mmCIF file of C-alpha atoms and ligand atoms in Angstrom:
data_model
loop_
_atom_site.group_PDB
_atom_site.id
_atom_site.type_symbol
_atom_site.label_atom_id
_atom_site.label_comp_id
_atom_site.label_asym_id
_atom_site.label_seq_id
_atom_site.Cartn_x
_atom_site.Cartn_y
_atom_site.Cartn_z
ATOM 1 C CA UNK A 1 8.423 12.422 -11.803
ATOM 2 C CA UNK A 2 7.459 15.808 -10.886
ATOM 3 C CA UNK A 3 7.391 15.891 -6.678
ATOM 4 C CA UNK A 4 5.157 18.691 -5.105
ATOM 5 C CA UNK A 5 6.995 18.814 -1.908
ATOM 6 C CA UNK A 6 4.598 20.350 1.449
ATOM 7 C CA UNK A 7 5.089 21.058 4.798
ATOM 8 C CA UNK A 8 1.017 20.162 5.387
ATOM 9 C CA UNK A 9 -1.759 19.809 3.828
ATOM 10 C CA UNK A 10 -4.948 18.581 4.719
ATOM 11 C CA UNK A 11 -4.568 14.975 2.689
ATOM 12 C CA UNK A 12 -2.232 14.487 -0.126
ATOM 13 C CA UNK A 13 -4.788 12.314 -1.739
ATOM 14 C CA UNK A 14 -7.435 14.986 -1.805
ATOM 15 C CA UNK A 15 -5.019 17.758 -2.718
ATOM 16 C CA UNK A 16 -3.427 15.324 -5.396
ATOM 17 C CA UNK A 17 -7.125 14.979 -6.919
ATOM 18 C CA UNK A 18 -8.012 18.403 -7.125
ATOM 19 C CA UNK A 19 -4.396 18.897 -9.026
ATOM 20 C CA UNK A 20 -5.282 15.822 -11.310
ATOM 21 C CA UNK A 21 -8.884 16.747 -12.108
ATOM 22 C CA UNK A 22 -7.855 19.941 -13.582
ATOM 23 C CA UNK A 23 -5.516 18.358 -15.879
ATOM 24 C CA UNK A 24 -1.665 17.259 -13.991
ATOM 25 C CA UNK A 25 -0.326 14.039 -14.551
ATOM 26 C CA UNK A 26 2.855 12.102 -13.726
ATOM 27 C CA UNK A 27 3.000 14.358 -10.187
ATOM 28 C CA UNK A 28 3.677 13.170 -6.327
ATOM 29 C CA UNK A 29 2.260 15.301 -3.405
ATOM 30 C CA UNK A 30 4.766 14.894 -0.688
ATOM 31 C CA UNK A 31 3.655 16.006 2.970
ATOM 32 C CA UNK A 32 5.500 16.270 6.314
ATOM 33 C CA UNK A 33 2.873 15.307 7.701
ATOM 34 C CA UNK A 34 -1.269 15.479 7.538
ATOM 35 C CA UNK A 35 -4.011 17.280 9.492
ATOM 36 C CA UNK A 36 -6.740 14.953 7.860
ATOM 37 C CA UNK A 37 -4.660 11.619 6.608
ATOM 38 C CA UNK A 38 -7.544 8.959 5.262
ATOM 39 C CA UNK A 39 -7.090 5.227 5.038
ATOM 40 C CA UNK A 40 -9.358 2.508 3.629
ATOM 41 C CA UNK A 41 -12.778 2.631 4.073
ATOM 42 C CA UNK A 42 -13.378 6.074 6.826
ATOM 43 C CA UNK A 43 -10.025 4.998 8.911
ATOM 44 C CA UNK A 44 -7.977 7.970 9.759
ATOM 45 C CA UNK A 45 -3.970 7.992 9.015
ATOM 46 C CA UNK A 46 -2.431 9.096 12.037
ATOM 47 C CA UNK A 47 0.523 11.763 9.805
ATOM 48 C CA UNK A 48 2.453 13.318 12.477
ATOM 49 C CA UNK A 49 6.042 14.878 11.609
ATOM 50 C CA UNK A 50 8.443 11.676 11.141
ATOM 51 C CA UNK A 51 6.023 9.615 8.505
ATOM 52 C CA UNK A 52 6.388 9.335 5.033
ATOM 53 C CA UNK A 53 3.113 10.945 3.370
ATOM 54 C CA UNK A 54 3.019 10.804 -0.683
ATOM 55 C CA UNK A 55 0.322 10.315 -3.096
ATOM 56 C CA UNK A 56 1.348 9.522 -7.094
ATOM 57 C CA UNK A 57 -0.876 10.463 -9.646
ATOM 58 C CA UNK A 58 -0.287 8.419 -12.557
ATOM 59 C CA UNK A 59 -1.913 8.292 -16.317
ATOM 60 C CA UNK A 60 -4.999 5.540 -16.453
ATOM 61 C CA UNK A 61 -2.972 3.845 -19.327
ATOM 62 C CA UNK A 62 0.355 3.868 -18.363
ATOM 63 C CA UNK A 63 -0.466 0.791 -17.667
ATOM 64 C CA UNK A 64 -2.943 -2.513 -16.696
ATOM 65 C CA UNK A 65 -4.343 -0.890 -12.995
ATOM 66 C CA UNK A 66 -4.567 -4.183 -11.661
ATOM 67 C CA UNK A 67 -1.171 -4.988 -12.291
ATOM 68 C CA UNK A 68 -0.255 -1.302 -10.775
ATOM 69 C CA UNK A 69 -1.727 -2.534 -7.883
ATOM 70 C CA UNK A 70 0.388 -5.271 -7.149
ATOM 71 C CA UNK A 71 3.661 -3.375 -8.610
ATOM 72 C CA UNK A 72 3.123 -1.091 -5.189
ATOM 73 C CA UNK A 73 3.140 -2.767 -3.233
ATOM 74 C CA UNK A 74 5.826 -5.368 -3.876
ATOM 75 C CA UNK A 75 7.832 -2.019 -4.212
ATOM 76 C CA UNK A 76 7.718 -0.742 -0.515
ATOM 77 C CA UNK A 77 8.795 -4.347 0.218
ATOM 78 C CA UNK A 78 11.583 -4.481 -1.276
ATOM 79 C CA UNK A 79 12.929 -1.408 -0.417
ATOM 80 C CA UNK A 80 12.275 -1.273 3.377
ATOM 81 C CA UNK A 81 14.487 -4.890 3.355
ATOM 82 C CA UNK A 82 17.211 -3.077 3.014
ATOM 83 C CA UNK A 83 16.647 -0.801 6.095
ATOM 84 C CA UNK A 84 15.199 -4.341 8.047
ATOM 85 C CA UNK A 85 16.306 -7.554 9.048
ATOM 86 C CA UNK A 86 12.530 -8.622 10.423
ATOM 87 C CA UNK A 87 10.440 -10.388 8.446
ATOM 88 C CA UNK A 88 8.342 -8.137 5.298
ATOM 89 C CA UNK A 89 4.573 -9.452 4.401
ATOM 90 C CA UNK A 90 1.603 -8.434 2.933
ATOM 91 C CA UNK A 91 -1.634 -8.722 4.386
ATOM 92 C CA UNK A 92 -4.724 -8.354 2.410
ATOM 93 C CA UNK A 93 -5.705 -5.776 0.833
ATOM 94 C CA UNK A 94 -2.651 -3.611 1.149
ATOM 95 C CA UNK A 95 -1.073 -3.354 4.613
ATOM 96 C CA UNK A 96 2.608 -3.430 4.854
ATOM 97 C CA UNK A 97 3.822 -5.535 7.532
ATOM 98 C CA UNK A 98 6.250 -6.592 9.570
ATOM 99 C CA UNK A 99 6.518 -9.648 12.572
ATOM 100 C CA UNK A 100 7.592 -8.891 15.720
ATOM 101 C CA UNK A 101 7.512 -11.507 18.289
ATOM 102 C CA UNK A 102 5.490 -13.846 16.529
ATOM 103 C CA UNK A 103 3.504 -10.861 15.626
ATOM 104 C CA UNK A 104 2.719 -8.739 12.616
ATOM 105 C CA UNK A 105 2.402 -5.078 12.985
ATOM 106 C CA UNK A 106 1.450 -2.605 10.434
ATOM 107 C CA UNK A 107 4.235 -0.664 9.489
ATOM 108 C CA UNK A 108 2.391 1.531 6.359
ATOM 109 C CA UNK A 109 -0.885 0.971 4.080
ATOM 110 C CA UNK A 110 -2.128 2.051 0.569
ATOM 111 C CA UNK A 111 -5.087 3.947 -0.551
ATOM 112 C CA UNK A 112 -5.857 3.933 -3.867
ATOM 113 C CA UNK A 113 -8.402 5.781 -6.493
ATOM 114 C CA UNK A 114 -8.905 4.799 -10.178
ATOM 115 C CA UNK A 115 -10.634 7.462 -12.767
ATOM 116 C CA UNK A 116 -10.779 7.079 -16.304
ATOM 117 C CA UNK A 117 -7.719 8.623 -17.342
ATOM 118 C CA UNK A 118 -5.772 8.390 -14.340
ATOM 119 C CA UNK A 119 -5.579 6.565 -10.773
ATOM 120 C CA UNK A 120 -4.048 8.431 -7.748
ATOM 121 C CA UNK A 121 -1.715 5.673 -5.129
ATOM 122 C CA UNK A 122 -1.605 7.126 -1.737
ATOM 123 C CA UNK A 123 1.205 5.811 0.028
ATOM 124 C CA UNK A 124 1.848 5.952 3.863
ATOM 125 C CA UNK A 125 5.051 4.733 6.146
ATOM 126 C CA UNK A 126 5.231 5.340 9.200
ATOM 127 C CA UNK A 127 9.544 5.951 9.446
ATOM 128 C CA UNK A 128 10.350 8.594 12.542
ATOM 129 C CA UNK A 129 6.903 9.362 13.347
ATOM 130 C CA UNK A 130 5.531 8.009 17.101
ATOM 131 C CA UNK A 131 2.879 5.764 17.457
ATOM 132 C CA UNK A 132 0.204 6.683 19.645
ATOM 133 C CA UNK A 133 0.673 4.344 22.690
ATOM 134 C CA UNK A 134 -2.878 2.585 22.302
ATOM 135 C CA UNK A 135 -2.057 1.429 18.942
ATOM 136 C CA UNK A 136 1.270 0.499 19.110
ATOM 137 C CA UNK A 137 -0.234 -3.321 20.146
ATOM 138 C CA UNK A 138 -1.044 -3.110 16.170
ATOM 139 C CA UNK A 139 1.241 -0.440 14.893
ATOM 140 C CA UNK A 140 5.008 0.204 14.659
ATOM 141 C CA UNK A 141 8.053 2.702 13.284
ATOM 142 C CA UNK A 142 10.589 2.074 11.270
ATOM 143 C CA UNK A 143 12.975 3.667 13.886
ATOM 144 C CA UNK A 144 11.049 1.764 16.195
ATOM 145 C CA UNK A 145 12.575 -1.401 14.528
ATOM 146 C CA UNK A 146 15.906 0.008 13.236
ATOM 147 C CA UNK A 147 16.459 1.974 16.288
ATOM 148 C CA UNK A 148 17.997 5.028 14.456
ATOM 149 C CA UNK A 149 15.905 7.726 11.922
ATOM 150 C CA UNK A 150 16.163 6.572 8.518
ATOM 151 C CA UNK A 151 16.494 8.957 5.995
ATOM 152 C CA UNK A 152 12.561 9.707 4.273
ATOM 153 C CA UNK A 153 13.971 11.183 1.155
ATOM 154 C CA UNK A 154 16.366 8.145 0.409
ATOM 155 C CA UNK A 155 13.360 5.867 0.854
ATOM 156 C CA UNK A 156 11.229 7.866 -1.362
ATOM 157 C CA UNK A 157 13.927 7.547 -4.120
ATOM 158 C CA UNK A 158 14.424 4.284 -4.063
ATOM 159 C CA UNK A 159 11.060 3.578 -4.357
ATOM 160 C CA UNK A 160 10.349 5.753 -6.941
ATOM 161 C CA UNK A 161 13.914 4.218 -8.639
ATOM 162 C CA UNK A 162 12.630 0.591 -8.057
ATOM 163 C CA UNK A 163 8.833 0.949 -9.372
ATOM 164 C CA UNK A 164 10.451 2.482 -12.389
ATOM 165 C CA UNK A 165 12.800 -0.107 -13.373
ATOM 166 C CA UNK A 166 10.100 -2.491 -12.883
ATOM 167 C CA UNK A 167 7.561 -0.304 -15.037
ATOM 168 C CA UNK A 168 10.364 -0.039 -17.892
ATOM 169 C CA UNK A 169 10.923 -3.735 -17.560
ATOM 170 C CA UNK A 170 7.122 -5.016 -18.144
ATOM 171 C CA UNK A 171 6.707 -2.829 -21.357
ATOM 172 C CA UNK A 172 10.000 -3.777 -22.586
ATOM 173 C CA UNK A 173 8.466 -7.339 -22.207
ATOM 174 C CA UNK A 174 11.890 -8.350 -19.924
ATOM 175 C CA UNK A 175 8.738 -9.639 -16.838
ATOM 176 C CA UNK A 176 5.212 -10.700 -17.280
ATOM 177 C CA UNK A 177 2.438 -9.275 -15.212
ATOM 178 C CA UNK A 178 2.284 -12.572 -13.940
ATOM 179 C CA UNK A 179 5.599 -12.853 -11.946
ATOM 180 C CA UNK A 180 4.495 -9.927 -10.296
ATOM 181 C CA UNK A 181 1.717 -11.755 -9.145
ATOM 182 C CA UNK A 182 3.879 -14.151 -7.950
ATOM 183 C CA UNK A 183 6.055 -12.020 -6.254
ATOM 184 C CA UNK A 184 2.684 -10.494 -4.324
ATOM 185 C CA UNK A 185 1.894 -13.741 -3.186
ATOM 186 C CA UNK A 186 5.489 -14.338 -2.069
ATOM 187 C CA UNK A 187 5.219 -11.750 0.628
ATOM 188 C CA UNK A 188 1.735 -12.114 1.321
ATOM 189 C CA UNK A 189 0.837 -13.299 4.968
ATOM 190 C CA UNK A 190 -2.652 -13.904 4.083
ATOM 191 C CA UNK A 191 -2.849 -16.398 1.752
ATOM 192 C CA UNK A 192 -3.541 -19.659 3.787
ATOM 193 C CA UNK A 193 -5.328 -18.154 6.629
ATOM 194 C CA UNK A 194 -8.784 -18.936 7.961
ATOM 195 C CA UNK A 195 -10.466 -15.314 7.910
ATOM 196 C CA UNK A 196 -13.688 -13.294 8.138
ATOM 197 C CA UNK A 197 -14.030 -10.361 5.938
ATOM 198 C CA UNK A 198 -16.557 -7.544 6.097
ATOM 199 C CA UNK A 199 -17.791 -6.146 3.017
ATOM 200 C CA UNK A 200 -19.083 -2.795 1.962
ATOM 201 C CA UNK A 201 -22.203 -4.463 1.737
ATOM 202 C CA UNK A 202 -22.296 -5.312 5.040
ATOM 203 C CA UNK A 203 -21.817 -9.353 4.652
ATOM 204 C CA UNK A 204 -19.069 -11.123 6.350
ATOM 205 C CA UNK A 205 -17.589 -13.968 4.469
ATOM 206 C CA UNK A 206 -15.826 -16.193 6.601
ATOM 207 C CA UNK A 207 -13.321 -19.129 5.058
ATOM 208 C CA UNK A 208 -9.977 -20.405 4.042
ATOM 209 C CA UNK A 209 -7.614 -17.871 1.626
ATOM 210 C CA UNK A 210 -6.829 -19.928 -1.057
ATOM 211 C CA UNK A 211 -5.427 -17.529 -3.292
ATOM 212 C CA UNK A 212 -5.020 -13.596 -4.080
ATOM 213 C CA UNK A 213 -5.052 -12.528 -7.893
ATOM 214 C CA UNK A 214 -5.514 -9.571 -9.980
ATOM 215 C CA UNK A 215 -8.927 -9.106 -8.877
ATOM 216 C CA UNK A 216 -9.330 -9.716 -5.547
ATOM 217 C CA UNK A 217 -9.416 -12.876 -2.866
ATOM 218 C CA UNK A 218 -10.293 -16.110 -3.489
ATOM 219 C CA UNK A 219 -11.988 -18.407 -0.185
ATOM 220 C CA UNK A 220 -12.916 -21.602 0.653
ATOM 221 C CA UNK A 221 -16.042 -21.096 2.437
ATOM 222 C CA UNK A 222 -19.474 -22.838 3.443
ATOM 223 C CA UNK A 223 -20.711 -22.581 -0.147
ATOM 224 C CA UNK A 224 -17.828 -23.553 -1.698
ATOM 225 C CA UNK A 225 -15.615 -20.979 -3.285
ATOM 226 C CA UNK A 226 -16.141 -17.585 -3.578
ATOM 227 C CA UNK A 227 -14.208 -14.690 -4.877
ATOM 228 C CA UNK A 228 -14.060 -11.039 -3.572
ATOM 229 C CA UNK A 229 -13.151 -7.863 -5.384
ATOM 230 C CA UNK A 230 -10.441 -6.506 -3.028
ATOM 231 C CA UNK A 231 -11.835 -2.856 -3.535
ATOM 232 C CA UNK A 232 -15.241 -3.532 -1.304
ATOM 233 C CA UNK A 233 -13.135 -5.435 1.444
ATOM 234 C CA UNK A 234 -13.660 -3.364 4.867
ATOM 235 C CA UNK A 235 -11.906 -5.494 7.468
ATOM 236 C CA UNK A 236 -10.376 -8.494 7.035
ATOM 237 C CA UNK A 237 -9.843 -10.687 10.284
HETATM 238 O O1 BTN B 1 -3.963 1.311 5.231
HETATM 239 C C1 BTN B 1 -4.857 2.123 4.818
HETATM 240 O O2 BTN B 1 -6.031 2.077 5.250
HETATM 241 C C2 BTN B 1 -4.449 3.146 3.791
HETATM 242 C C3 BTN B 1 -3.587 4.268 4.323
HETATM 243 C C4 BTN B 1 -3.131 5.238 3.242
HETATM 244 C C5 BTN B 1 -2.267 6.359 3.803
HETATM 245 C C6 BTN B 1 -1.747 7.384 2.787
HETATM 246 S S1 BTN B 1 -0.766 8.675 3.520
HETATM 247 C C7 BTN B 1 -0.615 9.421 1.881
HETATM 248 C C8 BTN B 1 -2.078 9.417 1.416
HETATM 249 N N1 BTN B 1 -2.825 10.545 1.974
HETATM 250 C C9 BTN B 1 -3.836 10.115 2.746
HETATM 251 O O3 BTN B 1 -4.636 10.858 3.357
HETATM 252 N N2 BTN B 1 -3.877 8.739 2.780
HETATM 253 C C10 BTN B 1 -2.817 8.165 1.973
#
């Protein structure tokens, strides 16, 4: 997979859209770091020199989206468990976590954009990079954990390496899309939680997670049980 490695750029989702709409495919924009990094929903992505900044474009029919969803996921995880002992999760939609002191911090997220023929994965770690002081209550490093700078380039190719073999594995029929499902909802740290989540329509539905598929969320709530598309999920608390 063709790697467009920059010192800086603005956002290497917007730069990796502008690439894809005039025709590349199969391409990662790799950044040191980001003057405008965007998260879900108008956050900004704190990119200063240390963080691991990539965005993959990849062909709409490569393969099922949804299932490319989960795939990314479960990736990161099992990568970064070989540079940490602490405990991996995933909390809903996409955050990559990790507990410390009873605690889960936010070690990286994922932004994702789906077009007809192709869907662009914005990935962000944070490795070496500092956390700004006020956030570090919610935030943390790699080397923060570790306590020594991992290598960004090793990381990048093993997860590269690892969603690969697991890529070449579901066409060749050797998984179903279902175990990776199951392996989502392995590491996730959300199922099972009482939460309130506010929509891009501005309601908050508050209840218990029963279960995360494909699609989205599923609660228990007031009215019984609803279901959530994980795409229009702002905040979930
Ligand atoms: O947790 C989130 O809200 C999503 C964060 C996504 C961050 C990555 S960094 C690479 C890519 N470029 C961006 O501007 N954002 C994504």
């Amino acid at each position: 997979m063709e790697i467009i490695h920059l010192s800086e750029i603005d956002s290497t989702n917007d730069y990796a859209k502008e690439l894809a709409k005039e025709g590349k495919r199969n391409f990662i924009v790799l950044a040191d770091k980001q003057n405008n990094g965007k998260g879900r929903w108008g956050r900004v992505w704190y990119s200063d020199e240390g963080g691991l900044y990539f965005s993959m474009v990849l062909d709409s029919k490569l393969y099922n989206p949804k299932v490319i969803n989960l795939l990314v996921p479960i990736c990161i995880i099992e990568v970064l468990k070989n540079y940490v002992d602490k405990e991996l999760g995933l909390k809903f939609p996409n955050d990559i976590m990790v507990k410390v002191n009873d605690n889960y911090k936010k070690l990286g997220g994922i932004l994702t954009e789906l077009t007809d023929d192709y869907m662009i994965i914005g990935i962000g770690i944070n490795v070496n990079n500092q956390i700004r002081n006020e956030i570090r209550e919610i935030a943390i490093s790699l080397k923060e954990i570790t306590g020594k700078e991992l290598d960004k380039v090793e990381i990048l190719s093993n997860f590269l390496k690892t969603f690969e073999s697991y890529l070449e594995k579901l066409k060749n029929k050797e998984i179903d899309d279902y175990e990776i499902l199951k392996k989502y909802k392995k590491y996730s740290i959300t199922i099972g939680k009482q939460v309130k989540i506010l929509l891009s329509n501005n309601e908050i539905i508050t209840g218990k997670v029963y279960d995360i598929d494909f699609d989205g969320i599923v609660l228990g709530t007031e009215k019984g049980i609803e279901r959530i598309p994980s795409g229009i999920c702002i905040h979930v608390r």
